[PDB]
């Protein structure tokens, strides 16, 4: 049973995307997202998330999300 390292930590990831909205525009979408990993689920995260998963995976997620919100005309 070798130790697994996660550092299950809430980081304030400053995210910046120029995405306009439904229309085109230079909109500096600054989202400082304070976020953790799913400590309530299961150890397999180590294979996928491992360490420094915050800036690893979550800044891609936030880009998809801000598109589903901002790029749909919200801004």
């Amino acid at each position: 049973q070798y130790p697994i390292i996660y550092d299950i930590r809430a980081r304030p990831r400053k995210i910046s995307s120029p995405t306009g909205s439904k229309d085109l525009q230079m909109v500096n979408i600054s989202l400082r997202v304070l976020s953790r990993p799913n400590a309530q689920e299961l150890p397999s995260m180590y294979q996928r998330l491992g360490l420094d998963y915050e800036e690893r995976v979550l800044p891609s997620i936030v880009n998809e999300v801000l598109k589903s919100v901002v790029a749909k005309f919200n801004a």
Binding site: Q1, Y2, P3, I4, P43, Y46, Q47
Partner: peptide
């Protein structure tokens, strides 16, 4: 020492696939 020379990288979540010097990548779950 032998913990990783004689024994594979058997640490939780890790895998160490057999590259056979004389046959190539032994595509085996090991």
């Amino acid at each position: 020492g032998v913990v990783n020379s004689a024994l594979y990288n058997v640490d939780a979540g890790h895998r160490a696939v057999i590259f056979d010097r004389f046959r190539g990548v032994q595509d085996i779950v090991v």
